[PDB]
Amino acid sequence: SPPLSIMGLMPLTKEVAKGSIGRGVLPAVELAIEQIRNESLLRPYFLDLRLYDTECDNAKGLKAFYDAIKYGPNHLMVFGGVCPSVTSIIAESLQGWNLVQLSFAATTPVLADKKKYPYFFRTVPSDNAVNPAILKLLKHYQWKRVGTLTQDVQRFSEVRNDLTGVLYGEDIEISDTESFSNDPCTSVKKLKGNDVRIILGQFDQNMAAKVFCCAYEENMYGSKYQWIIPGWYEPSWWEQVRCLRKNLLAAMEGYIGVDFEPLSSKQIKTISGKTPQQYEREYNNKRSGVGPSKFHGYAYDGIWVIAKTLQRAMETLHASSRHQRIQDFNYTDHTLGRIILNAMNETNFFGVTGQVVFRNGERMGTIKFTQFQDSREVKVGEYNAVADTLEIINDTIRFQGSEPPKDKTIILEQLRKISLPLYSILSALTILGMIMASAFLFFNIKNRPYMNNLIILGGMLSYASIFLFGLDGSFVSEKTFETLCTVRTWILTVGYTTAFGAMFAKTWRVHAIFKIIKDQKLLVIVGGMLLIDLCILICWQAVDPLRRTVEKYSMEPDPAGRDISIRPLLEHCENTHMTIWLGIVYAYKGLLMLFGCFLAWETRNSKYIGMSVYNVGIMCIIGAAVSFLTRDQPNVQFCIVALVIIFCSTITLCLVFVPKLITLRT
Amino acid sequence: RRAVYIGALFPMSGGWPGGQACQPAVEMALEDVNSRRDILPDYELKLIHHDSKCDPGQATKYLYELLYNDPIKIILMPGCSSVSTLVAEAARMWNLIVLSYGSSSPALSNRQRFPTFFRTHPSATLHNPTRVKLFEKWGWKKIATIQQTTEVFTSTLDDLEERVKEAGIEITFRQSFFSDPAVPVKNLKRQDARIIVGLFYETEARKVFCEVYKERLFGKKYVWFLIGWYADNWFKIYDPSINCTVDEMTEAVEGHITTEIVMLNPANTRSISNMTSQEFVEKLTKRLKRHPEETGGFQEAPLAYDAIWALALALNKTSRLEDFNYNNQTITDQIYRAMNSSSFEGVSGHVVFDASGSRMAWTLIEQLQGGSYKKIGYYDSTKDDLSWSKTDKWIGGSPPADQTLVIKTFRFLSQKLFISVSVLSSLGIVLAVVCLSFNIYNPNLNNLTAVGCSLALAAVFPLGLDGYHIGRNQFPFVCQARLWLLGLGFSLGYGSMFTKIWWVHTVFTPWKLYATVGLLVGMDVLTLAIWQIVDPLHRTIETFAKEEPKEDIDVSILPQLEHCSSRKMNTWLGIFYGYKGLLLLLGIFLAYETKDHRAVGMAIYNVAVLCLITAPVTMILSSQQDAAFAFASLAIVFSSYITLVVLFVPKMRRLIT
Numbered sequence A: 001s002p003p004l005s006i007m008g009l010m011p012l013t014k015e016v017a018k019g020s021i022g023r024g025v026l027p028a029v030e031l032a033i034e035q036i037r038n039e040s041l042l043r044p045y046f047l048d049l050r051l052y053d054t055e056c057d058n059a060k061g062l063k064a065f066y067d068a069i070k071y072g073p074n075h076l077m078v079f080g081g082v083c084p085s086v087t088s089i090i091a092e093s094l095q096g097w098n099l100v101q102l103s104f105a106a107t108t109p110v111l112a113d114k115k116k117y118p119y120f121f122r123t124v125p126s127d128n129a130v131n132p133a134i135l136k137l138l139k140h141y142q143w144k145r146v147g148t149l150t151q152d153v154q155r156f157s158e159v160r161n162d163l164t165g166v167l168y169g170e171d172i173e174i175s176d177t178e179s180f181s182n183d184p185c186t187s188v189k190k191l192k193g194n195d196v197r198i199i200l201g202q203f204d205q206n207m208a209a210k211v212f213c214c215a216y217e218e219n220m221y222g223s224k225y226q227w228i229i230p231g232w233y234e235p236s237w238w239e240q241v242r243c244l245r246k247n248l249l250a251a252m253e254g255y256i257g258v259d260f261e262p263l264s265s266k267q268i269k270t271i272s273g274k275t276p277q278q279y280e281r282e283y284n285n286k287r288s289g290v291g292p293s294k295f296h297g298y299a300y301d302g303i304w305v306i307a308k309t310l311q312r313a314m315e316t317l318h319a320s321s322r323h324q325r326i327q328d329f330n331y332t333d334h335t336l337g338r339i340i341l342n343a344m345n346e347t348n349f350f351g352v353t354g355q356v357v358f359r360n361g362e363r364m365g366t367i368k369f370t371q372f373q374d375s376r377e378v379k380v381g382e383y384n385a386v387a388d389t390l391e392i393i394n395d396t397i398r399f400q401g402s403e404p405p406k407d408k409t410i411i412l413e414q415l416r417k418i419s420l421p422l423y424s425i426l427s428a429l430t431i432l433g434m435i436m437a438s439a440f441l442f443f444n445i446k447n448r449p450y451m452n453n454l455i456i457l458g459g460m461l462s463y464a465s466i467f468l469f470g471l472d473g474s475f476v477s478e479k480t481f482e483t484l485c486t487v488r489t490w491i492l493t494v495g496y497t498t499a500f501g502a503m504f505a506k507t508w509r510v511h512a513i514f515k516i517i518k519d520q521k522l523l524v525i526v527g528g529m530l531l532i533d534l535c536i537l538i539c540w541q542a543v544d545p546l547r548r549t550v551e552k553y554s555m556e557p558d559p560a561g562r563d564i565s566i567r568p569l570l571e572h573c574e575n576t577h578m579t580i581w582l583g584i585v586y587a588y589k590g591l592l593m594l595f596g597c598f599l600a601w602e603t604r605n606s607k608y609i610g611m612s613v614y615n616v617g618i619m620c621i622i623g624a625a626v627s628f629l630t631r632d633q634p635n636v637q638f639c640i641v642a643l644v645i646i647f648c649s650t651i652t653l654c655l656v657f658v659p660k661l662i663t664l665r666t
Numbered sequence B: 001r002r003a004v005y006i007g008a009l010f011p012m013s014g015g016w017p018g019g020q021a022c023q024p025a026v027e028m029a030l031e032d033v034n035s036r037r038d039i040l041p042d043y044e045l046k047l048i049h050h051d052s053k054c055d056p057g058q059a060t061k062y063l064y065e066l067l068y069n070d071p072i073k074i075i076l077m078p079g080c081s082s083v084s085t086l087v088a089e090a091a092r093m094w095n096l097i098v099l100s101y102g103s104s105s106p107a108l109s110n111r112q113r114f115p116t117f118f119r120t121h122p123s124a125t126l127h128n129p130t131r132v133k134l135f136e137k138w139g140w141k142k143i144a145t146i147q148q149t150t151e152v153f154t155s156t157l158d159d160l161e162e163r164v165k166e167a168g169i170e171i172t173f174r175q176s177f178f179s180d181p182a183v184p185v186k187n188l189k190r191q192d193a194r195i196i197v198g199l200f201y202e203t204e205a206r207k208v209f210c211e212v213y214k215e216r217l218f219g220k221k222y223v224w225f226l227i228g229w230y231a232d233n234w235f236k237i238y239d240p241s242i243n244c245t246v247d248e249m250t251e252a253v254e255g256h257i258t259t260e261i262v263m264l265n266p267a268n269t270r271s272i273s274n275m276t277s278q279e280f281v282e283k284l285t286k287r288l289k290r291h292p293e294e295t296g297g298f299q300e301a302p303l304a305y306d307a308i309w310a311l312a313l314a315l316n317k318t319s320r321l322e323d324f325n326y327n328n329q330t331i332t333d334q335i336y337r338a339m340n341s342s343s344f345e346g347v348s349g350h351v352v353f354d355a356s357g358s359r360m361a362w363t364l365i366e367q368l369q370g371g372s373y374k375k376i377g378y379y380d381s382t383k384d385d386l387s388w389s390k391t392d393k394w395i396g397g398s399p400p401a402d403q404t405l406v407i408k409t410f411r412f413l414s415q416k417l418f419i420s421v422s423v424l425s426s427l428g429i430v431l432a433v434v435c436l437s438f439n440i441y442n443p444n445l446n447n448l449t450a451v452g453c454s455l456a457l458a459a460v461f462p463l464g465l466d467g468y469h470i471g472r473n474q475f476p477f478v479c480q481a482r483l484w485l486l487g488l489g490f491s492l493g494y495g496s497m498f499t500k501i502w503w504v505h506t507v508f509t510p511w512k513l514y515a516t517v518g519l520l521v522g523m524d525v526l527t528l529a530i531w532q533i534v535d536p537l538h539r540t541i542e543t544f545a546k547e548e549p550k551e552d553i554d555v556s557i558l559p560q561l562e563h564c565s566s567r568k569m570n571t572w573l574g575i576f577y578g579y580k581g582l583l584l585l586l587g588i589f590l591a592y593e594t595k596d597h598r599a600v601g602m603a604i605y606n607v608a609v610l611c612l613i614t615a616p617v618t619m620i621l622s623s624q625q626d627a628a629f630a631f632a633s634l635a636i637v638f639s640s641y642i643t644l645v646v647l648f649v650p651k652m653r654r655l656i657t
């Protein structure tokens, strides 16, 4: 039978550790070729394989390739290549004879282009096949803020460049894009300065122990951060290589490892007829000397791929003519290579790794999530991109916290409250001044003429105003009461102007005498400034709505260590452009009060009324002074204005009556 | 004889079609060296050659085609750069020596990876000392760089960074692309840089210039640095891959600086060939039917020429060389030892190459000036000689730079409004002194009030302007002196005014009262001294306006003003205004209380409302151009004028009425 020759280009020596890999993957392909001899898928021909040692030096590999070209027979395919330079160079040069090279360990995305490499295919999942997986894991546990850290190597910068290419369209933020070369410790410094919660590391093996030891020095661990790291190092690599393993182990737990999964968990019949369990058992009892490889699955699948490929392209219309065209290939033909490319590219079937497909020189693989649980890694979850499902292994994951941490700095706000045990004693003092007012009104009607009644009206309105001052502020059970602060401030101002008009018109008439129609003129002169203050009330209504405003005082503390910050807020009734209005109102009050304040110095030789108007004008100006020098704390200002209001509004009646009834009741 | 065969390679097209010119050059060179029997008494030179278009697939096919055939070749000649690296990497397995002629990779200077490799072409790092001197001439600091993603450009950009870092010039915007110019020219428009250096081949130079015309990023503040060994017609060849027309590109590429290096003797000398450079160039223009402005590789053909002549003299230095096989090494080491000590004088001057390379002395620099290139000057790096010719036109003459800023001082109105203020103060002084002399020459509290109002009319002038007299920057001293004098003057005048109405209110209801009111006046100088002890003076700077109000020049105008202040002066001046307002309202109440007295009360009623209406309008104002100083001076001089012209009306009018 005429043989169909094919050539494998593998490192077979002992001077390189990848010779162990080639010697490990040789039993799977010889078992596969003996299975092909068992089934005998091809009556007239028989397959032949010629092995060639490379050691992946470029000159020696091209020399062995040239020797095989010059001296060997009419080869049909070429197979293999592990070292990236001699794969890159052969994949660029392959079109000079229009042939196809099949690899199984080239794990660099630079072979993704087909204008550069139209004849190249691979079955190993690349490093860009973890990027849908990490998005699905993040949406599985709702993470928002992340900081990246990429080592300045071409591969890490390439996957960093592809993070942006895969990240487009979702609610994701990338804050700290630090890219160091050999000092990761200042990078952890910068990361702690931007205090980002989740690390997505990209570096080599030797940098990792130094990064975690001087991240212990920054204390970048705890129940606050996660670390997503590519975990393809050798197991227990950290046992050999300024920082002790005692000061490393209590911070090297919880580090999420992102690998590719070798096998599956299906016990289903493949096209071989066996299960992955039977295949692995037969493999490990096939061999005994070699250290176990982890690529023999891809070697076994790809041999059956190309065998099914050559039988489906062998089926041509040309029974005779193609059989001569294969038997007389002088390396020049390209139409046969085009049909072989079409029949190989449309390969889709189920093997040991699963249902294999091909999306542009790539097979859709299985991504193995893992976690370093208790001094070792454990498999925790899978993800299949052909179906886009992310399996997880419940009852296996653990957390040093209790919830997968929240990522942004989350805040909460509330109003500034006042001391209720301070407010309650003032609410108890509310009633006594009012009852004394309504009792001395009955003493005045027992005397029964309008002057002390107007004084009592001002006192009652003041005792109502000082009650409803802070009753609307902190207790916000009446929510739309900031519109009514002006509707009670006009009540307060009317009581104020009534009391001070009864203080002022009497002393002005005492100055003018120092007739009953003159008392009528005095009453209408008080009514004139009453209506002047009513016009100022409607001018305050027209000048601003005085609506509900909120001052948001932002300091964001934490009383009990939780990251839910607190920010207080204060209700403000003003509209911040009535400063001219309140300034002219306070000047109006000062001009109305300084007349009597100056005149009390003169007429001292209405005997204690000037001493009353002085001893209330000082308290009123100290109330305005402490009013403008506060609202930093809305409790002390309100209690001090309640204190001065219950001072003045009953001290006027007390110093106007304390000798009156004492001399009338001797 | 003996036909000795030499393999060769000529890229006829692709990114650099130099082999179109070098092939007749080497044909001429082989016919000229096929003349002397003293160099080769026994052999005969033969040439085998192909094309590769700087394509490694064809290059690998042609290397196999020459290697695995007949007859045996000895020396190879690779054209492009990546293919030159590949053949110098793989020449060791046949024990061969390789000679390149166009590569510029400075990493190709290593002898470990490349023991059997030489190159006549000098590297790309001799654009950087000339680049940093042309940057040092104009002091520009914000430069942006853009490159195609290649090793032969990143080793240049790394040499330029590690050369510019000692000069203290930062490189801010460092971008890169591969074949998409849209997003990086979007980023350059969004980063609005001034001077831009680019490193890419021609077909994308046309694409990036279509993109920069489309983004409208050419123009006034944009300087483009490119290499200059392109042809002069390059923006004229029809390329249907882009829809841009020829003259908007021609207007866009106008006025940019290009750099290169020399390739041959600028003088006229004679080689061993007994010809010169100029006659050689004449012979190339004779035999080449195309134009030198349209062909490729025309400037570099003499390095190929002296490369053959050098190897020919090396072969004469070796002088039984007919049994060469790729396995042995003795012939190769003997020829290598003879070629190592190669040092002579050829058409390009002294030809030494078994050193660290870069043996050229002068470089060259041009500028597109109106549809044609034109020379700026010459240079040498060792002697640091920058030969000039002063032909650089610019946008109207000046070189556009990065960005500047102007600090503008906020001008006063030292004009007729100030001169009117000064003349009203002088008129008040003269009127006051004339009325006081008339009163003395015919009310001692009235004389003291006249002295105080004269001191106010003497302190009215020295409010200053925006730095206009002999000697400045003592503005706190002169303003604090004027303020102290005006304070004491107003204190004296108002105290001697108010003490009369105080005593008339006392008499309504000899030097005791006068001496106690004089000490009441001198209390204010104790307040002035307490203001002088803890924080007397300060000349602060306000930056009240926004930067860059200018319309055409990119120098941001920041207007800054100055007012005399202190450490904490606001509450102090508020307290002093409150104290003086207290005294003034006391006077205005006593004038209605104890109603000389009628005129004194009416003068008090005028001066009080004047001072109270102008305290706030000088307290809360800051635009001193026509409001603050104008209102204050109008207030003070109208006060003193009207108060004097009312208080001395009844004296002199009724003395002779």
Ligand SMILES: *[C@@H]1O[C@H](CO)[C@@H](O[C@@H]2O[C@H](CO)[C@@H](O)[C@H](O)[C@H]2NC(C)=O)[C@H](O)[C@H]1NC(C)=O
Pocket: A342, A345, A346, A358, A359, A360, A361
């Ligand atoms: C490999 O798979 C198919 C095999 O033909 C190709 O993609 C097909 O292209 C044809 C023609 O353009 C379309 O009609 C089909 O719809 C495509 N898809 C499929 C599934 O057949 C192409 O050769 C390769 N495609 C990929 C994605 O690698």
Ligand SMILES: *[C@@H]1O[C@H](CO)[C@@H](O[C@@H]2O[C@H](CO)[C@@H](O)[C@H](O)[C@H]2NC(C)=O)[C@H](O)[C@H]1NC(C)=O
Pocket: B243
């Ligand atoms: C290059 O130019 C061609 C022709 O001008 C463009 O194709 C369109 O051609 C039709 C022909 O009827 C015109 O009506 C359209 O106006 C053309 N489109 C435009 C945008 O000009 C082609 O689009 C141009 N290339 C690009 C990139 O715009």
Ligand SMILES: *[C@@H]1O[C@H](CO)[C@@H](O[C@@H]2O[C@H](CO)[C@@H](O)[C@H](O)[C@H]2NC(C)=O)[C@H](O)[C@H]1NC(C)=O
Pocket: B270, B274
């Ligand atoms: C170049 O060749 C010429 C002749 O082939 C050389 O000699 C010339 O000889 C004549 C004989 O009388 C003299 O008159 C000329 O002055 C010579 N030319 C010179 C000196 O340039 C000549 O020496 C050769 N070499 C050079 C460098 O020109």
Ligand SMILES: *[C@@H]1O[C@H](CO)[C@@H](O[C@@H]2O[C@H](CO)[C@@H](O)[C@H](O)[C@H]2NC(C)=O)[C@H](O)[C@H]1NC(C)=O
Pocket: B038, B039, B313, B316, B317, B318
């Ligand atoms: C080039 O070849 C010549 C062979 O003719 C070498 O030697 C010559 O030797 C004779 C006899 O002594 C002298 O008269 C000539 O002057 C020599 N030629 C030259 C050019 O000097 C000569 O040594 C060889 N040159 C080199 C550099 O190898």
Ligand SMILES: *[C@@H]1O[C@H](CO)[C@@H](O[C@@H]2O[C@H](CO)[C@@H](O)[C@H](O)[C@H]2NC(C)=O)[C@H](O)[C@H]1NC(C)=O
Pocket: B340, B341, B354, B355
């Ligand atoms: C080829 O050139 C000369 C001649 O054989 C030698 O040059 C030596 O170069 C090294 C490198 O720096 C120096 O340290 C030696 O002093 C040089 N020796 C000399 C000039 O005699 C050497 O054999 C070769 N290599 C180089 C680089 O020159």
Ligand SMILES: *[C@@H]1O[C@H](CO)[C@@H](O)[C@H](O)[C@H]1NC(C)=O
Pocket: A394, A395
């Ligand atoms: C899976 O997780 C849920 C929720 O925690 C739990 O109730 C259930 O028992 C888990 N299943 C197994 C098999 O542990």
